[PDB]
Structures are given as structure tokens and as C-alpha cells.
Amino acid sequence: LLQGLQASDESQQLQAVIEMCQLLVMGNEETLGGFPVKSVVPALITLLQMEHNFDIMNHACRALTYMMEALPRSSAVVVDAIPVFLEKLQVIQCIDVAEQALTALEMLSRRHSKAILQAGGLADCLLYLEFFSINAQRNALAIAANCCQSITPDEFHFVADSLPLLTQRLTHQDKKSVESTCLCFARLVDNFQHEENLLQQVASKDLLTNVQQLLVVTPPILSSGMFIMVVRMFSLMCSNCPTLAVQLMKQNIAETLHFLLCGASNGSCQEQIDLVPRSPQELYELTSLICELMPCLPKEGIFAVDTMLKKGKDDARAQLMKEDPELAKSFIKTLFGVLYEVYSSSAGPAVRHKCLRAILRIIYFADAELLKDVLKNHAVSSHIASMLSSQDLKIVVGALQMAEILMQKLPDIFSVYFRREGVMHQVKHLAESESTISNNREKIKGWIKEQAHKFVERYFSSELNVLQRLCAATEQLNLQVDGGAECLVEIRSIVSESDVSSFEIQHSGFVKQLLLYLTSKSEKDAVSREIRLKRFLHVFFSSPLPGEEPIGRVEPVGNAPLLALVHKMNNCLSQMEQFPVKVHDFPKKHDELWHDGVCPSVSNPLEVYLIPTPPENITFEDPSLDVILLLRVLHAISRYWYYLYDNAMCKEIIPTSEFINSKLTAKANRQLQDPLVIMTGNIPTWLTELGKTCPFFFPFDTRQMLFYVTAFDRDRAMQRLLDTNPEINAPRLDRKKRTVNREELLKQAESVMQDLGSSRAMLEIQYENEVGTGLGPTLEFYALVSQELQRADLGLWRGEEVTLSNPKGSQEGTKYIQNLQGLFALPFGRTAKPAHIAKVKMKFRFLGKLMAKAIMDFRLVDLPLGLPFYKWMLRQETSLTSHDLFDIDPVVARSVYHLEDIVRQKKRLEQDLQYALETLTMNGCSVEDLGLDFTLPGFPNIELKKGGKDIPVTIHNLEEYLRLVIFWALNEGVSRQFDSFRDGFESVFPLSHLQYFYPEELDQLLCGSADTWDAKTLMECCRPDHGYTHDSRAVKFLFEILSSFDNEQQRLFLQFVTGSPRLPVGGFRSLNPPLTIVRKTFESTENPDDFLPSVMTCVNYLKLPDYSSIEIMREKLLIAAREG
Amino acid sequence: MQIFVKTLTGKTITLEVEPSDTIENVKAKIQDKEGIPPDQQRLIFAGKQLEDGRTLSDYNIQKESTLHLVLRLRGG
Amino acid sequence: MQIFVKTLTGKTITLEVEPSDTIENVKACIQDKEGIPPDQQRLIFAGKQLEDGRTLSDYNIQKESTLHLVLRLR
């Protein structure tokens, strides 16, 4: 087809180019083998140069555009056409060749971005960039940022014309162009770091004003993978041109780095500075900015060993602290607290070098009256003591150097706060302790011991009212000393009000003398553990003394002492802590129940925690190991304290969220996210063993994310990781097919579960010959089977029986079971039929095989179970009291509470007889005035003991009866079901692995609560496009409607829009690809108020017509969604 | 109010419009003052093109906003 | 607006699109009915190929428009 391009008739070449197009378009490299590119490209350029007829021009540039997609081995010849390509950009005659020539070069700039640049094409592509359409602009700005890369520094004259253009492109909003503008400058600065001459010309006053205003923009126009290389661009400026670093401090870099990290710049100096959740790669860069805005440190003096730590110039910044002393003040008085919080929170190896080293630079270059003003509300004193006592090299050395300089500049304050926080002792411990890469460590050890020896000799060879009071009142808590009540009222006054250190508590022996004060199990003590623990809770809870138990309930008032005790104990945990974070860095059995009526006794759970030794699943050696075991004892007394009393409420002392250790949280969250940990499975053994034994240190999201990694194979764990943090980039799994009826639901459900629990693969639900396949039916399956398992004809659950709307089409409804407090199982007596029973024990085997398979495939199940159902699942059934009857059967439990008042008034007057037992009238009604016999009230076919229905419950067996009610209703009558429920659960997946969780926090393991549905989250996560903006009329009308649904219209909307009726892991942000909102097309004769927003759920569009008002779109959505 | 319209030659004209007055009303005003057929009259404002149905208030045009004018030939 | 998509084998599939759908959409509503990923595919509409950011209203492609498809050899 070659010589037709060589024709003399201009319409003949116009015909032959379209033959030459589709020869190369629909072919490929396999089919077009032998295509003579060596002649066609000089032909197409000659056809391109015929500038009079634009159609000869247009298809010629389309023909070269497609040749590289036909032959990637031909792109070496295409490079010759670049001046003629740019010739149509220099003087534009046909704009559809101009937008065509850009996409010809945007393919070339991946391999030949120098050849454009040597041809001067950087100024040419950006020249008429105001005119093109968006797909052509995104071509040229990606021709720009490719040509900004391989520049020899002699060639600045190419870029230098274009620089006020690209500095304006940081104000556009097209997100693939702004992230092609920022790629250009951050490839300039990486090539102009050796020349302060040009780097002062790259950085204008406007480049450092736009990029500064770019990062404050909420929602982030930049990605989180570009917010790095914007901020890292500032680093290779300031470490090679200090004048720009001066100029960044001139242009208010403080309110930038305050707003990026302290959240909203809310005017007030935040005491609890809230961190915006940033990655462990962004915080390494938002501090290597702050590390290079303060002057460099000397290499002689006390800093002289810093030549060795990295063995693994009249500064204008130094003039800036002189030439503008208020600019250093306004830098440091606000941006120090960032470096305070960022260092203390995270657990990076390399972040904690860099956040440390910028506190060296702030302290060493502040003067005396600045550090007195900055460090005034920052406990740096205790903070060094942790850094002093590390097992790392650089964190000890940098603690010494801050210990050196703080004593020099301020000895009138930091001599007090280096003895009352253990800085003196730990350095003195460093001086007196004795014992290439193997070389450098001992010289640092040689450096530290000498530097510690100089330090005490200079400052602490000279020579505590609170450590008096805490070494003394510790040893009135001895085992063999009757300290009375006031040996803790002192500690109620020491730990609450007066400032204590975390070195006084650490070494006045106060930790082990409260572990042993509460968990001592010998008769050699002066005071028994019953009397001690009730004195203890008289101090930290204001519960009554032994013998002062009043007539009413044990009435809590306020937990504020034990609240304060845990926090100061948890502060002492934080500083003493040394757990490693391995991150791979990249810088006939006589039934006395039935024959007699003898219940097994209430097993107090508290008696397993109150043990002084560690439990035998703790195998980690810790300097703070004694502080954990005080909290585990302090968590058990916070939670299970009502057992020690009688009428104490089911109202725990301190909520389990308060015990969350904010450093141990953060050291875990960074530990869980490393992918080389999980595929190899070598989780650090301090993490799991803390989780099971002390779950209360962690927030619920952590333990949940902890649970889905420890308990499974090399495959399902990593899939959980990608569901929550999608920025890594899903192993080989299996999904064996099944097929399910919509009307033979339950019987086929028990058939699929019967032979698909054994393998460790995923479950495939697919209806009987229906179009919708994928995650649509499977997450509808468990919402149907859970709709199925509350049928009143199955006879499984307690509670009332209510006919509901049944939107699923089952218009019979079968009178579904709904309880206000939750669904606990039904009691069976011994008078139940052996076929009525073994039918039920195939449902609770199924229900256990349901909820176990509900977890391994990450699904959810909507069963509003009662609270004491979960206690039976975590094996806490032996502890259930009359405060667990109230969360199952809220009519009986008013009778059981009002009859234990008779039982507690039985033992009141028995101690002081036979006539007084008859006078016990509950609202004028005695025991026989109820007329109750040994049958569970509400299940009269169930006799409690043998023939107890013939046995009237009287005052002489009421104590036996209220044990027998609560044992049958909560323990015995329900026991036959659960012995299969705990068996069916454990057929695949053991119930030990659920011990990370609690009773009241397994509801949120398989239900959820659903997610964010305000407009602010919708704005940051939806991507309006192809006709709509964030200020369009429909998108403003859409997002106001989505914040006014119930919890089912949200399920309706996602059913129609996304496909599945519930949001995936983490709000809208994890939708792949995210929610696109396109305006729907019509013609001129069509009113858009009479149409429906049809969609495509495979890539999640919402082709929304622009309805005229807000209520019309409100009505069309509910119609278009419910129509499946 | 009034807006600015550029072109590929460089001459900037000034229409007299309101937050109203849709594209075919005002790209006819191009032909009313430049004699250019609206078959090929592309309008570009901040990169995105201007389809025929929507207004100028729907495109968030402020006073003396700069947009552009572009001649296609027949293609799409 | 029902359209058509023809592959190399002539296996003419159909789609039920709007004119307001995009080109990466109908790059991936053919993902449903053959196993060829959205980066190995070139939709061709009578000589030109199609940008990955345009709608179908802007291309003036309408009902019964028999386009084409070529496997991009990755």
C-alpha cells in the first residue's frame, strides 16, 4: 500500500492513507511482520508536510500514531518525525492534528524524552496547551514531565521559558495533569541539586507558593504516592540551597506542616494534637523537610561520633536565626509539637532516627530563653530516659547529646527534671556498665561510657519528697504487714493529685507490691484476700468495706481514682516498654441436679486472673513484664468485680477502651502491615501472647486485624491486609461451584455446608440459572439464610413472634422471631422427645458451621444474637448469673431479682425465725402466693428436678429454686444444643482463636454497625467525571440525598450502584475502581425529569440525568434501585 | 456581564452574556461577529470542552473568564 | 442504545450501553464474556482507535455501530 502514499493526485494519497491506516490498525506485530517502516515514515512525514489539505495531514499523523502500537520495534524510526511533529505544534493549522501529534509524542516520551528535549520540544508542546482538550493536555504534560527528567544541567534554557507555564499548572484541577506537573519539577530538582544557580531559578516565588497551597487542599488533589515526591522535592532543595530553605521559612512553611500533621489548624494550641493518619513513608518525608529547615549540626565537639553512626559553608540558615530572630521563634514555637507527637506516636526504625535528629537541631540552635518557652509543656525529661535505656545504638547516643546540651543551656531546670525522671540514674548506669560493622559498635560503646562518665562528673557528682512517700507506702503494702485502710489512701493521694515520675513508681518497688498485694494466696498474710480486695475497691472505686455492705445494691459513683491509676500505670508501661518491632525496612453419675436439685456452683472468673506469676502462655522477657501483669489484674478487677459482692451491678468499673495502650496500639499497627512478616508467618511472639492474655491493650480494629492473620494459612491473611490498606499493589485460592434454589433455601444450605467446611477454600453461591453472579449472590446468601434461621416453626429461639414486611418475596413470612434484647436458644427438659431434640441439634450444628464459615471467607451475617449467647461461644458459660438472665428473658428477670431480695432478706434474719419466713411478702405476696413449682416460668413442660412440678417452691427451697431457675434457663436447658454448636464450630476452625475478643464485641465481628454516610466522605471518595464537577447541580443534589437514608436505602443504593448491598472494607475508599458519577446523555426532545439513572456495576458508574429539582432525583433513585 | 474568548490566531473578543444563555446561543454569537459555522466551533474552558446543551452558569463561568475556540474539520 | 463489538474471530458480542458510557467501560463490559484484560484490547471504530477517557456521545458512535477489537500483544 506504499506507493499510493507516493501518488501525485492529492485525493489519491488521501484515499491511500486510510488504506495505510487500517493495514496497521487492525494488524499487530505478529501479523504485520515485514512492514517496511523505513519507507512509510518518510512517506507519512511527506504527507504530513502537505499543510494545505488537513485531511491528508490528519490521517497521516494517525498513521504514525498507530505504527508503534503495531510495531514496538519501529519506534526507533518514528523519532525522525519529531521536528515535523513539533512543526504542527509550533504553528497550528489543524487542531485535530495538533491533538493527534501530542499523543504521537506521549508514546515517544517513554523512550525518547531526550530527543524531544534536544529538539527543543518542551517549549513547543506546552505552547498552545491552553487550547487542547483534556486527553491532549494530559499527553503534553506527560511529555513535559518526561522531558524534565534526563537533562544535563547545561540545558536549562529549554525549561526556562516554560517555567511560568508549569508554575500555573499547579493551579489546575485535572488530577492526571497536576500529577504530571509535579513529576516535572521533582525531576528538575533531582537534576539541579548540584547547582544553586539554576535551583534558585527553578524555585520561583510562585512555585513555592502554589506547591505550598497545593498540599493544604482538602480533598487531596495529589495522590498519597505523589504527596511523597512533592515533599521530597523540598528536601533536595533545602539541603543544597539554604536560601530557598530561608525562603521557605519566609513563606510560612509552619502553617503548612502544622495543617498536614496536626489536623485542622484550629487556632488554639492543641494539647492532644490529633495526627492525620499518614503512612510510614510520608512521615519520613514530612520530617526530612523539618530536618533540613534548621541548621546543620557540627562535626566536632560532642557530635564527633556522628561520623561513625553513619558508617553502616557559612550557612544562611545559621545567619537566618541571627538575621531574623523572630522567624526562628515563629518556626519553632509551633512546629516543635509536631516533632514531639510524630516521634512519640509511630514505631518506625528510620522515622525515629529522623524525628530524633531534628530535635537535636532545634535544641542546639535555640538559645536559652527559647527552650524554656518551647519545652514548657512537653515532658522531654522522662522521654529521654526511655531513649537512654534503649538497646539501640543511635537512640542512646542521641539521648546523650540531648542530655549534654539541655544541661548546658538550662541547668537551672533540667537538674531537677533529670533526677526526678531517671536521667541521672540511667546515664550513671551507662557509665558504670562494662559488658567494619563489628568494629564500630564497641567504639560507640567506648564513646558512650566515657561520655556518660564526663556527664555525671560534670553535673551529677554533687549529690525527693515524693520518692520518700512512695518508697515508704510501698512497704505498707507488704504481704506480712497489716497496713490498715490508709496505706492505700496515701496512694490514692500520691497517684491522683501529686506528680509522680515513671522512675519513682518503677523503682520504689510499687509494681510488684501491688501485684502481690492483690494476688496473694497464702495464710501467712496479715489480711486475707477477701478483705484486701474490698479495701482496694474502697480506695479506687468507693465500694463499701468488708462488713459495711448496705441493704441496697452496691452503688458505683465514679471510677476516677482507678481511672487515674491505670493511666499512670500505663504511662509506666509506655516508658519501660522494649518490645521489638521486626519491620523489613525499605528506606451412674449421680445427677444431683435431677435427683436432688444441686446446681454446680457459680465459677468466679476472677480467680484465674488473680495469680502473681505470669500465665504459662507468656514467654516474652520484658523490662515492663511486671507492669503488664498488674494491668491484667487491674483489668479483671475493673470488669469482673461484681462477683466479690452480692448485689453489685453488671456495670464494670472502667470501659475496656480506656485500657488501650496508645504506644502498644501503635507498635502493633506498624507490625501488622509488613508483608514479609505474614507470608512467612513469623509474627513476633510478644504480639500474639499479649493479644490473647491481655486483649484490653488494643482497640477492636487491631485485635480484629490481628485475628485474621494469626488464625489461618499463608493465604487468607494477606487477603485481609489488602482489604484494609490497598496501597501495596491475592494468592492462589479455590472456589468450588455450588448451585442454590431461592425456595429450597434452608435444605440446600445444610447440604452445601455438609461437605464444604473441610477444605480451606472459599464458598461459591450461585443461584439456579440467574444472570447476577459473583459477590452478589454470596453476600445475599448469608442474608437469606439468616433471614431463614429466625423462623418460628424451627423452634430454636426465644422471644416474641412478629410477622414483618418480607421484602425478599417470601410473602408467607412464616412469623419471624424478633427479640428486643437478642435471640438466645430454647430450653429442653428431660420431658422432650428424642426426635424433637435431634432435629434441633442439626440446626445448631448448622448454625455453628454457618458462623465459622462466615468468618473464614470474611462475610457477614445479620443475626441479632443476645449477649449471653456469645459467652457460651467463648466458653464462659460456667459464670452466668442473674445479670445474664436479664439479657435473655426480660420478664422472668424482674421476678428473679425481686425474689433474691427475699433470699437476701432470708439470710438477714436467719443470722439473728420460722414465723419470719412466712412474713416475707413481696408486694403483699409470699412465696406460695406466686404458687410457683420447680418448672421454668414460661416453659411449663420442663421440670427442674425429678418430679419438681409436684414439689411446691417454698421458703425452704427458694434458695434452691433461684439457683435452679438460673441454672436451667441459662446453663442446663440450653446445654444440649450448644454441645453441638461448639462442636460444629470447631469442625473447621477452633473456638480458642476467638478468645482475642469479648462477649460484647463479637456482635461487631459478624454484623458491623453501617459506615460513613455524610457528604464530606462522599466528596472525597466519589469521582464526578465526563460532564460533572464537585460543584455541579446534580452532584450537589445527589450527595445531599445520600446523607438522608435509613440503613436499608443505603443497602438499596449500593445494590443498584455497586452490585452488593453493603460497603466493602473501609468506607467508600476501597471501591475498585471508585464511584464514578457521569451525566447521562439524551437528545433535544427529551425532558430528563422522566427517566431513570441506569448504571453499569462492573466498573461502578452512575449515569445520572440532571433532574431539575432535588425531590425528583429523590424519587427516581428509589424506583430505579428496587427494579432489579 | 461579559466574557473573553481567544482563538488560534490571537484575537480576543468580548461577548455580552449572563449566567444563562446556552452554548448554541453564544456560539451563534461567534458567527454573528466572526462568521464561523458552528459545525466545527469547539469551545474549550480549562481543558474541558463545552457540549451543546449546558449553559454558562452550569460551567461556572465568572466575569471576563478566558476560554478558547477551536476549528475541527468533520471528525469526532 | 444497543451496540456491537466484533473480535478477530467474528464472535460478534452485543452490549447494552448508554451513549453516556465511557470507553474503558465497554473495554470491561467485554471482560464479562471473554478472559482478555482491559489493557490488551484496542477498540477500533472504522479506522481510528478510541481514547480511554472519552464517552460514546463525544465519539458520535450510535446504535448498531459495528466496531472492532484487536488483542494488544503484551
Short mmCIF file of N, CA and C in Angstrom, two decimals, chain A residues 201-290:
data_model
loop_
_atom_site.label_atom_id
_atom_site.label_comp_id
_atom_site.label_asym_id
_atom_site.label_seq_id
_atom_site.Cartn_x
_atom_site.Cartn_y
_atom_site.Cartn_z
N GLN A 201 16.46 29.39 40.25
CA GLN A 201 15.58 29.81 39.17
C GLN A 201 14.42 28.84 38.94
N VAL A 202 14.62 27.55 39.22
CA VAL A 202 13.51 26.60 39.21
C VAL A 202 12.49 26.97 40.27
N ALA A 203 12.94 27.09 41.50
CA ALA A 203 12.07 27.56 42.57
C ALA A 203 11.83 29.04 42.39
N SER A 204 10.67 29.39 41.87
CA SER A 204 10.29 30.79 41.86
C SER A 204 9.76 31.18 43.23
N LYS A 205 9.22 32.38 43.32
CA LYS A 205 8.40 32.71 44.48
C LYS A 205 7.03 32.08 44.36
N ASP A 206 6.61 31.75 43.14
CA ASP A 206 5.29 31.19 42.92
C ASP A 206 5.29 29.67 42.96
N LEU A 207 6.40 29.02 42.60
CA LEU A 207 6.50 27.58 42.75
C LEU A 207 6.39 27.18 44.20
N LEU A 208 7.03 27.93 45.08
CA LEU A 208 6.94 27.66 46.50
C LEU A 208 5.71 28.28 47.13
N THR A 209 4.83 28.89 46.35
CA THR A 209 3.55 29.36 46.84
C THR A 209 2.41 28.48 46.36
N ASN A 210 2.52 27.96 45.13
CA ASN A 210 1.50 27.05 44.62
C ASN A 210 1.59 25.69 45.29
N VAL A 211 2.78 25.09 45.28
CA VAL A 211 3.02 23.78 45.88
C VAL A 211 2.74 23.82 47.37
N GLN A 212 3.02 24.94 48.00
CA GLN A 212 2.60 25.16 49.38
C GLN A 212 1.08 25.22 49.50
N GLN A 213 0.41 25.89 48.57
CA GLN A 213 -1.05 25.88 48.61
C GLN A 213 -1.65 24.61 48.06
N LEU A 214 -0.87 23.80 47.36
CA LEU A 214 -1.38 22.55 46.80
C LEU A 214 -1.66 21.53 47.89
N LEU A 215 -0.81 21.46 48.91
CA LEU A 215 -0.91 20.40 49.91
C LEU A 215 -1.99 20.67 50.93
N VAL A 216 -2.45 21.91 51.05
CA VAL A 216 -3.48 22.25 52.02
C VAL A 216 -4.86 21.87 51.48
N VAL A 217 -4.95 21.58 50.18
CA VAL A 217 -6.23 21.38 49.51
C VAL A 217 -6.88 20.09 49.99
N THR A 218 -8.00 20.23 50.70
CA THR A 218 -8.78 19.07 51.10
C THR A 218 -10.06 19.05 50.28
N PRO A 219 -10.34 18.00 49.49
CA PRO A 219 -9.70 16.69 49.29
C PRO A 219 -8.37 16.75 48.56
N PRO A 220 -7.47 15.81 48.83
CA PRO A 220 -6.13 15.88 48.23
C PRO A 220 -6.14 15.66 46.73
N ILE A 221 -5.83 16.71 45.98
CA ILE A 221 -5.68 16.58 44.54
C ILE A 221 -4.52 15.67 44.22
N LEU A 222 -3.45 15.76 44.99
CA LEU A 222 -2.36 14.82 44.84
C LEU A 222 -2.74 13.48 45.43
N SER A 223 -2.17 12.42 44.87
CA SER A 223 -2.28 11.12 45.49
C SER A 223 -1.36 11.06 46.70
N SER A 224 -1.51 9.98 47.46
CA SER A 224 -0.58 9.75 48.55
C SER A 224 0.74 9.18 48.05
N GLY A 225 0.83 8.80 46.78
CA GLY A 225 2.10 8.45 46.19
C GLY A 225 2.81 9.60 45.54
N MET A 226 2.16 10.75 45.46
CA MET A 226 2.74 11.98 44.95
C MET A 226 2.97 13.00 46.04
N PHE A 227 2.19 12.94 47.12
CA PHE A 227 2.45 13.75 48.30
C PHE A 227 3.80 13.44 48.93
N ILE A 228 4.34 12.25 48.67
CA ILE A 228 5.75 11.99 48.95
C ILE A 228 6.63 12.85 48.06
N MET A 229 6.51 12.70 46.74
CA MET A 229 7.51 13.28 45.86
C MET A 229 7.31 14.78 45.65
N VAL A 230 6.22 15.35 46.16
CA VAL A 230 6.17 16.79 46.35
C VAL A 230 7.01 17.20 47.55
N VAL A 231 6.88 16.49 48.67
CA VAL A 231 7.57 16.89 49.88
C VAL A 231 9.05 16.54 49.80
N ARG A 232 9.39 15.41 49.18
CA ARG A 232 10.79 15.06 48.97
C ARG A 232 11.48 16.01 47.99
N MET A 233 10.72 16.70 47.14
CA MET A 233 11.29 17.75 46.31
C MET A 233 11.78 18.92 47.16
N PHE A 234 11.05 19.29 48.20
CA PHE A 234 11.51 20.34 49.11
C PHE A 234 12.78 19.95 49.85
N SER A 235 13.04 18.65 50.02
CA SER A 235 14.23 18.24 50.75
C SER A 235 15.49 18.42 49.92
N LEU A 236 15.45 18.04 48.65
CA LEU A 236 16.65 18.24 47.85
C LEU A 236 16.82 19.67 47.37
N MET A 237 15.88 20.55 47.69
CA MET A 237 16.14 21.98 47.59
C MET A 237 16.89 22.47 48.81
N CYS A 238 16.33 22.25 49.99
CA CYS A 238 16.85 22.86 51.21
C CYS A 238 18.18 22.28 51.64
N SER A 239 18.52 21.07 51.22
CA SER A 239 19.82 20.53 51.58
C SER A 239 20.88 20.88 50.56
N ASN A 240 20.56 21.69 49.56
CA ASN A 240 21.55 22.14 48.59
C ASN A 240 21.45 23.61 48.24
N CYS A 241 20.37 24.29 48.60
CA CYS A 241 20.30 25.75 48.53
C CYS A 241 19.66 26.26 49.80
N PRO A 242 20.45 26.74 50.76
CA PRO A 242 19.87 27.21 52.02
C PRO A 242 19.04 28.47 51.88
N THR A 243 19.26 29.24 50.81
CA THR A 243 18.49 30.46 50.62
C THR A 243 17.02 30.14 50.36
N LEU A 244 16.77 29.08 49.59
CA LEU A 244 15.40 28.60 49.41
C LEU A 244 14.84 28.08 50.71
N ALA A 245 15.69 27.44 51.52
CA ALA A 245 15.29 27.00 52.84
C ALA A 245 14.99 28.18 53.73
N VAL A 246 15.76 29.25 53.59
CA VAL A 246 15.38 30.51 54.22
C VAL A 246 14.07 31.00 53.65
N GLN A 247 13.91 30.90 52.33
CA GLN A 247 12.74 31.45 51.68
C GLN A 247 11.49 30.65 52.00
N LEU A 248 11.64 29.34 52.20
CA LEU A 248 10.50 28.54 52.65
C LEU A 248 10.08 28.94 54.05
N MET A 249 11.04 29.25 54.91
CA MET A 249 10.69 29.74 56.23
C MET A 249 10.10 31.14 56.16
N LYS A 250 10.47 31.90 55.13
CA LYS A 250 9.86 33.21 54.91
C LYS A 250 8.40 33.07 54.51
N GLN A 251 8.08 32.07 53.68
CA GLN A 251 6.76 31.94 53.09
C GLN A 251 5.82 31.09 53.91
N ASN A 252 6.01 31.06 55.23
CA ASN A 252 5.10 30.45 56.20
C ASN A 252 4.92 28.95 55.95
N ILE A 253 6.05 28.24 55.99
CA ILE A 253 6.03 26.78 55.93
C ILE A 253 5.47 26.18 57.21
N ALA A 254 5.32 26.98 58.27
CA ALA A 254 4.86 26.48 59.56
C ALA A 254 3.41 26.05 59.49
N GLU A 255 2.55 26.91 58.95
CA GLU A 255 1.13 26.57 58.86
C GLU A 255 0.87 25.48 57.83
N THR A 256 1.81 25.22 56.93
CA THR A 256 1.69 24.06 56.05
C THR A 256 1.92 22.78 56.83
N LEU A 257 3.07 22.66 57.48
CA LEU A 257 3.39 21.43 58.19
C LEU A 257 2.60 21.29 59.48
N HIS A 258 2.00 22.37 59.98
CA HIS A 258 1.04 22.22 61.06
C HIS A 258 -0.24 21.59 60.54
N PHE A 259 -0.74 22.09 59.41
CA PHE A 259 -2.01 21.60 58.86
C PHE A 259 -1.90 20.18 58.31
N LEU A 260 -0.73 19.77 57.83
CA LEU A 260 -0.60 18.42 57.32
C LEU A 260 -0.61 17.39 58.44
N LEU A 261 -0.19 17.76 59.63
CA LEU A 261 0.02 16.76 60.67
C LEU A 261 -0.81 16.98 61.92
N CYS A 262 -1.09 18.22 62.31
CA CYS A 262 -1.93 18.48 63.47
C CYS A 262 -3.41 18.49 63.12
N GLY A 263 -3.77 18.05 61.92
CA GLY A 263 -5.15 18.14 61.53
C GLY A 263 -5.52 19.56 61.15
N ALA A 264 -6.71 19.97 61.58
CA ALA A 264 -7.18 21.31 61.29
C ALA A 264 -6.44 22.32 62.16
N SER A 265 -5.94 23.38 61.53
CA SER A 265 -5.29 24.48 62.23
C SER A 265 -6.38 25.31 62.91
N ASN A 266 -6.78 24.85 64.09
CA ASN A 266 -7.98 25.32 64.75
C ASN A 266 -7.76 26.55 65.63
N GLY A 267 -6.63 27.23 65.50
CA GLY A 267 -6.36 28.46 66.23
C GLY A 267 -5.79 28.26 67.62
N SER A 268 -6.36 27.32 68.37
CA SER A 268 -5.85 27.01 69.69
C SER A 268 -4.67 26.05 69.59
N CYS A 269 -3.69 26.22 70.48
CA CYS A 269 -2.60 25.26 70.60
C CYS A 269 -3.16 23.98 71.19
N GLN A 270 -3.28 22.95 70.36
CA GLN A 270 -3.87 21.69 70.77
C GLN A 270 -2.95 20.98 71.75
N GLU A 271 -3.49 20.56 72.89
CA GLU A 271 -2.70 19.74 73.81
C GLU A 271 -2.62 18.31 73.31
N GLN A 272 -3.77 17.68 73.08
CA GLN A 272 -3.80 16.43 72.33
C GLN A 272 -3.83 16.79 70.86
N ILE A 273 -2.64 16.92 70.28
CA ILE A 273 -2.51 17.17 68.85
C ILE A 273 -2.95 15.91 68.10
N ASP A 274 -4.02 16.02 67.34
CA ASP A 274 -4.54 14.89 66.59
C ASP A 274 -3.69 14.69 65.34
N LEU A 275 -3.18 13.48 65.14
CA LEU A 275 -2.49 13.17 63.90
C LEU A 275 -3.49 12.79 62.82
N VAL A 276 -3.36 13.43 61.67
CA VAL A 276 -3.92 12.88 60.44
C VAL A 276 -3.22 11.55 60.16
N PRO A 277 -3.95 10.48 59.88
CA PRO A 277 -3.29 9.18 59.69
C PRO A 277 -2.48 9.12 58.42
N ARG A 278 -1.18 9.20 58.58
CA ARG A 278 -0.25 9.18 57.47
C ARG A 278 0.50 7.86 57.48
N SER A 279 1.12 7.55 56.36
CA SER A 279 1.80 6.28 56.22
C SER A 279 3.15 6.32 56.92
N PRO A 280 3.82 5.18 57.06
CA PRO A 280 5.24 5.19 57.45
C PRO A 280 6.21 5.51 56.33
N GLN A 281 5.76 6.05 55.20
CA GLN A 281 6.66 6.64 54.23
C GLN A 281 6.44 8.13 54.07
N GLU A 282 5.25 8.62 54.41
CA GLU A 282 5.01 10.06 54.34
C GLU A 282 5.63 10.77 55.53
N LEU A 283 5.58 10.16 56.71
CA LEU A 283 6.16 10.81 57.87
C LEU A 283 7.68 10.79 57.86
N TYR A 284 8.31 9.89 57.12
CA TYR A 284 9.74 10.01 56.91
C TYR A 284 10.08 11.21 56.05
N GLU A 285 9.15 11.68 55.22
CA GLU A 285 9.40 12.81 54.35
C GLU A 285 8.87 14.12 54.90
N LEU A 286 7.76 14.13 55.64
CA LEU A 286 7.35 15.37 56.28
C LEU A 286 8.21 15.76 57.47
N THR A 287 9.24 14.99 57.81
CA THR A 287 10.22 15.42 58.80
C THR A 287 11.59 15.64 58.21
N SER A 288 11.96 14.95 57.13
CA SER A 288 13.15 15.35 56.38
C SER A 288 12.97 16.69 55.69
N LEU A 289 11.76 17.22 55.64
CA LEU A 289 11.62 18.65 55.45
C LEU A 289 12.04 19.40 56.71
N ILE A 290 11.48 19.05 57.87
CA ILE A 290 11.78 19.80 59.10
C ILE A 290 13.20 19.53 59.58
#
